[PDB]
């Protein structure tokens, strides 16, 4: 017997760090009545098979940690000290702070007299770190209170690229899943350091290699990922579109595209209207004055029924495919080699290896995470990847896909639950002021007259109704619609997003901020400005595991607490292994985990904190009245509760949804109280509720499908590793999205040896088919209006084809592809005192701002201090030796770091000049540890990207100088 584990109760959990979703086994003393004694990998989990990277592997040290918050702390205006207080106190005072700000600020109607029912004096940041049930409850608590400024992590890394995938495929999600990587014949890792940032992904990447796959890393730096790839190709920061444009030209010139796939399943055959043109770097319909396109100039030629015209022969000169050929002719190897700094020879090697997956019996995948896609043409970068995948028939197939790697363990879920200003849960838009009725709201959804176009979003009214029937089940949806706040139709959408929240704060336009499971004092670009700006808040609620740079900004570097009037509540939440609930990983796997030990000290699950805080606002409105109380008082929180506590189980059943009365739907009878078995059986007439239509099928009358731990597979399932009986993925357990594209018009796989789905005996066998219908009767992209994978994407602000516009402002003057240097739809100073390209990135051992990992002695042991990675050439230029202290400075700030001099960083060749890149981790902060150093975000501009509304953390101008010691 193992003494360490003797008498300890074993429970299962899911890693609280990255979106791989690794399984844990937790051992809790006293048969569960005590503290955790051990945390390690779950040997039975099909993703990690008991493997953990050092973050997963150190979760014991995170949980059983004497630096954790024990109870609420209170900081009074101008106070220089915390004051421990009770939960009853802190939530009472917070509930009074909410109502006071809401009553003072609530606007029943905007300047134009349109119903709005909102408050703009409160903002909320977070969080991808919360359980799906807590994310869904939180968003609905904030919106019932009338907030519109509701943002989190997703905005910074994911939001800039998601529209590329929605435009291309009809959904923003990662197309495949982690296990599926082992089926790929060629893996292109580009704008990803997955060996460090999704480490267990490399189990499956290296398994692909074992079966003959070529691994390709395209990165400005040589990383731990590069070390284990067959091909490392350096690329100059921001030269991704030239690189991908060259690959498109190469594929088209050499007829390496999969014609059968391209003809039937992409919009290659669609006839673009005469008004479309491109010249001198500008698409038709350009308004030079307003730096904006009239997109109606990009419209398709429509037939008598309003369906886009098609030439299935692909000969019509205004066929998408022939316009694509014309657009990318300029992207020759010489020009791409010159701008990328990648040798012509390496370009050919990569192009040949990857384009070889155009064959039906070969699958290529692209892995990207954040990389440098935050800028104005990041969306076009991803658009190019999507287009390459559609040309090579790699969408919907095993070992294919665009594997857009999610960051945080539940950033997929927290986006799904609508913790962004522009979306409700299930990607239903937040109504604007002009959407004055539910009927008007529903009218916005585009229709298709094509009989083969599923156009599944036509079902939206069922999902909006069911979601309003989940929040307010006694009210008719049309009536309920008026309870929820609306944004200004006239206002620019990015005015409600992350970066403008920091601008509004610094203008003193916010009384209250929720920093709920986020560290903005370290995570926000231009930390000096943001730390000052938080001073201009009246109050701040920080919900986190530890005291941090955000909770305690008022006593940070160069801050005088006496001058700072912000009232700060710190509410300590419990770690992941101390609560029950679900997290949705990058592959959309919604995985149930259980409590190991009970919450440490007086920490609480977020669900109990938010519910109790709300219940108190509710009480206080029932006995005083005040601004429009209806949304608060009628919000159905009874379904969120069991035994006087937040119930993960009951919230998850509501998010799935149940029948509110006996109903006939889809030609079957359903009883009152019964669970909705799928979003297919939701209604618009108020017969059904569902907090999130994507969750309909996740918790049925069969039970909690997210909690399934069943490795049962058919041979065809096991062959590609779908593990369909292990947890549940939206939508309705479709593991590989767009899988109808993996078969011909008879329903036979292109690649039978790696079949996803197959028509056998009048049934689709394998994966769950992504869209019902006999083979050859539906277009395979069911969430697209027209039903095709879009090579030509006319909904994109910068144009329907990706085009190189230089994202590196300062060191580049020339665009070899057109007369248009910078993005014509998008103020960098480029001060000569800062000649080096500063960049920030991750190491394996640290998590985000390091708030969590700087508290874990084993991770600090491995990576104790902020460092500065520089080339031998820059070292030799600035007289820096390996291990020397350096000062890194910009227009925004300065810090010290330990220099790491390495050939893993090389100078960029830009217009006959060596241009030097300087690498920093953003994992450090003044709070902890001693001599750790501060956030790299002291250096970064808040100067926002006009389009996306995300600032620059990947290419910002710095200087690096040796800090001299005594001889």
């Amino acid at each position: 017997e193992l003494q360490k584990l003797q008498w300890a109760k074993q429970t299962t959990s899911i890693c609280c760090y990255c979106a791989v979703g690794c399984g844990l086994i937790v051992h809790t003393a006293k048969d569960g009545q005590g503290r955790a004694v051990n945390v390690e990998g779950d040997p039975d989990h099909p993703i990690n098979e008991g493997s953990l990277c050092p973050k997963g592997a150190s979760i014991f040290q995170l949980g059983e940690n004497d630096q954790r918050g024990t109870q609420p702390l209170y900081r009074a205006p101008f106070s220089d000290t915390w004051k421990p207080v009770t939960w009853d106190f802190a939530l009472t005072e917070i509930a009074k702070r909410i109502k006071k700000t809401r009553d003072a600020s609530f606007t029943e109607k905007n300047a134009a007299g349109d119903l709005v029912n909102r408050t703009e004096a409160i903002a909320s940041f977070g969080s991808a770190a919360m359980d799906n049930e807590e994310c869904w409850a939180y968003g609905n608590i904030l919106r019932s209170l009338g907030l519109v400024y509701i943002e989190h992590q997703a905005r910074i890394x994911h939001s800039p690229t998601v529209p590329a995938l929605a435009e291309s495929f009809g959904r923003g999600a990662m197309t495949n899943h982690w296990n599926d990587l082992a089926n790929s014949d060629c893996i292109l890792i580009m704008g990803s350091n997955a060996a460090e940032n999704h480490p267990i992904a490399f189990k499956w990447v290296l398994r692909a290699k074992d079966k003959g796959a070529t691994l390709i890393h395209v990165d400005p730096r040589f990383t731990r990922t590069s070390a284990r790839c067959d091909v490392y190709a350096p690329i100059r920061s921001g030269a991704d579109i030239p690189f991908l444009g060259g690959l498109i030209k190469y594929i088209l010139d050499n007829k390496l595209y999969f014609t059968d796939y391209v003809r039937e399943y992409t919009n290659a055959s669609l006839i673009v209207g005469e008004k479309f043109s491109f010249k001198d770097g500008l698409f038709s319909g350009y308004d030079a004055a307003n730096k904006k396109y009239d997109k109606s100039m990009w419209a398709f030629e429509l037939d008598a029924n309003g369906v886009p015209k098609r030439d299935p022969a692909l000969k019509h000169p205004r066929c998408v495919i022939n316009l694509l050929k014309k657009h990318y002719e300029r992207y020759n190897l010489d020009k791409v080699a010159a701008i990328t700094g990648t040798s012509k020879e390496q370009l050919q090697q990569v192009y040949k290896a990857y384009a070889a997956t155009g064959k039906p019996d070969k699958a290529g995948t692209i892995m990207y995470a954040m990389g440098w896609t935050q800028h104005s043409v990041g969306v076009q970068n991803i658009r190019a990847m999507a287009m390459i995948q559609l040309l090579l028939g790699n969408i919907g197939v095993a070992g294919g896909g665009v594997n857009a790697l999610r960051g945080e363990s539940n950033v997929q879920g927290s986006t799904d639950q609508g913790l962004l200003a522009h979306i409700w849960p299930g990607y239903n838009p937040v109504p604007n002021s002009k959407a004055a009725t539910l009927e008007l709201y529903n009218a916005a959804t585009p229709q298709s007259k094509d009989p083969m176009s599923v156009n599944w979003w036509q079902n939206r009214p069922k999902y909006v109704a069911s979601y309003l029937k989940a929040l307010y089940p006694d009210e008719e949806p049309a009536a309920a619609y008026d309870y929820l706040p609306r944004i200004d139709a006239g206002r620019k959408l990015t005015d409600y997003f992350w970066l403008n929240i920091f601008e509004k704060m610094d203008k003193g336009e916010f009384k209250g901020l929720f920093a709920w499971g986020m560290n903005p004092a370290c995570g926000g670009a231009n930390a000096n400005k943001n730390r000052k700006a938080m001073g201009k808040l009246e109050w701040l609620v920080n919900v986190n595991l530890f005291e941090n740079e955000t909770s305690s900004f008022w006593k940070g570097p160069g801050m005088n607490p006496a001058e700072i009037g912000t009232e700060v509540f710190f509410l300590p939440c419990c770690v992941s292994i101390e609560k029950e609930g679900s997290v949705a990983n990058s592959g959309r796997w919604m995985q149930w985990r259980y409590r190991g030990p009970k919450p440490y000290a007086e920490t609480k699950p977020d669900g109990d904190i938010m519910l109790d805080m709300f219940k108190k606002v509710r009480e206080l409105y029932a006995k005083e009245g005040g601004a429009y109380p209806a949304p608060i008082a009628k919000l159905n929180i009874a379904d969120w509760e069991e035994h006087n506590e937040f119930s993960p189980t009951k919230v998850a059943k509501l998010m799935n949804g149940y029948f509110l009365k006996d109903t006939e739907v889809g030609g079957k009878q359903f009883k009152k109280g019964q669970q909705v078995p799928s979003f297919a059986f939701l209604t618009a007439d108020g017969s059904t509720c569902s907090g999130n239509w994507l969750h309909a099928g996740s918790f049925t009358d069969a039970g909690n499908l997210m909690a399934r731990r069943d490795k049962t597979q058919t041979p065809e399932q096991a062959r590609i590793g779908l593990f369909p009986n292990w947890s549940f993925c939206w939508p309705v357990n479709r593991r590989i999205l767009y899988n109808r594209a993996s078969v011909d018009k008879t329903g036979k796989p292109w690649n039978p040896a790696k079949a996803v789905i197959e028509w056998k005996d009048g049934k689709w066998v394998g994966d769950v088919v992504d869209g019902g219908g006999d083979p050859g009767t539906k277009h395979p992209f069911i969430m697209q209006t027209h039903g095709f994978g879009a090579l030509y994407g006319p909904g994109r602000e910068e144009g329907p084809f990706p085009e190189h516009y230089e994202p590196l402002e300062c060191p580049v003057s020339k665009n070899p592809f057109s007369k248009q240097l910078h993005n014509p739809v998008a103020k960098a100073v480029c001060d000569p005192r800062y000649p080096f390209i500063g960049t920030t990135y991750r190491v394996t051992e640290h998590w985000q701002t390091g708030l969590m990992t700087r508290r874990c002695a084993w991770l600090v042991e491995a990576e104790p201090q902020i460092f500065c990675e520089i080339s031998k050439e820059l070292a030799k230029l600035r007289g820096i030796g390996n291990g020397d202290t350096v000062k890194v400075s910009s227009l925004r700030g300065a810090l010290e770091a330990v220099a790491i001099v390495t050939e893993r960083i090389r100078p960029f060749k830009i217009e006959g000049v060596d241009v030097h890149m300087v690498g920093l981790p953003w994992h450090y902060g003044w709070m902890v540890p001693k001599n750790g150093g501060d956030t790299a975000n002291l250096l970064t501009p808040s100067a926002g990207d006009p389009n996306t509304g995300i600032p620059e953390t990947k290419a910002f101008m710095v200087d690096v100088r040796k800090v001299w010691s005594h001889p």
Binding site: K4, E40, S58, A195, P199, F202, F222, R224, R228, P234
Partner: protein, 214 residues
């Protein structure tokens, strides 16, 4: 007996193995600082039985040859450490005849610490300043005898770490060396007839660490 096969051609230097070793045994963290390397702790110590060593070698063309070496006791078939310790006191160093683990007991405090370390051709043994006890990797011998993989093996995501009976692991090592040699022509096994921790090096073992082989 038992054996590790460590395929360093698959290592991503994630350092899951380094953390997993400390978590299973609840070892303290060293005081460390950055001296111009990701490597830390910089060496094995009384409280560090395994550290991943990072070496950068230049190569023609882009990038480097980045060499990762997760260092640990080799659990030698005929351990010199035992022979040296047995000069001062038998029972200080013992051999588990079931698994082949070489095990330091609390009686290492009663032998000459420097001498036992000096006798180790891999320079593995480390002395506590306080108790003068010796420490090193114990093969997670308790876990192994109770059916479980060693902590560092179970945690390893890449398939670098492999553990089992010495027959199946020697056979895996020989099969894998043949395959890895196609990409890495200078690939060799570390002293494969003398040790129970058999490293596959992608080139000259000394490039990974000066005590990579005897």
């Amino acid at each position: 007996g038992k054996m590790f096969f460590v395929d360093l051609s698959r290592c991503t230097a994630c350092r899951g193995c380094q953390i997993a070793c400390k978590q299973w045994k609840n070892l303290p963290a060293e005081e460390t600082r950055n001296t111009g390397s990701h490597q830390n702790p910089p060496d094995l110590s009384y409280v560090t039985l395994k550290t991943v060593r990072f070496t950068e070698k230049s190569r023609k063309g882009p990038g480097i040859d980045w060499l990762f070496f997760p260092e640990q006791c080799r659990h030698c078939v005929e351990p010199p450490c035992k022979g040296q310790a047995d000069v001062d006191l038998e029972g200080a160093v013992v051999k588990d005849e079931t698994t082949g683990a070489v095990l330091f007991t609390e009686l290492t405090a009663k032998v000459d610490g420097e001498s036992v370390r000096s006798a180790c051709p891999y320079d593995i043994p480390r002395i506590d300043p306080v108790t003068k006890r010796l420490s090193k990797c114990d093969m997670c011998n308790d876990r192994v005898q109770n059916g479980l993989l060693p902590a560092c093996v179970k945690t390893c995501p890449t398939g670098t770490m492999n553990f089992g009976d010495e027959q199946e692991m020697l056979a895996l090592a020989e099969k894998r060396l043949a395959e890895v040699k196609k990409t890495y022509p200078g690939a060799v096994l570390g002293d494969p007839n003398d040790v129970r921790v058999v490293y596959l090096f992608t080139r000259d073992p000394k490039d990974f660490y000066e005590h990579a082989v005897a």
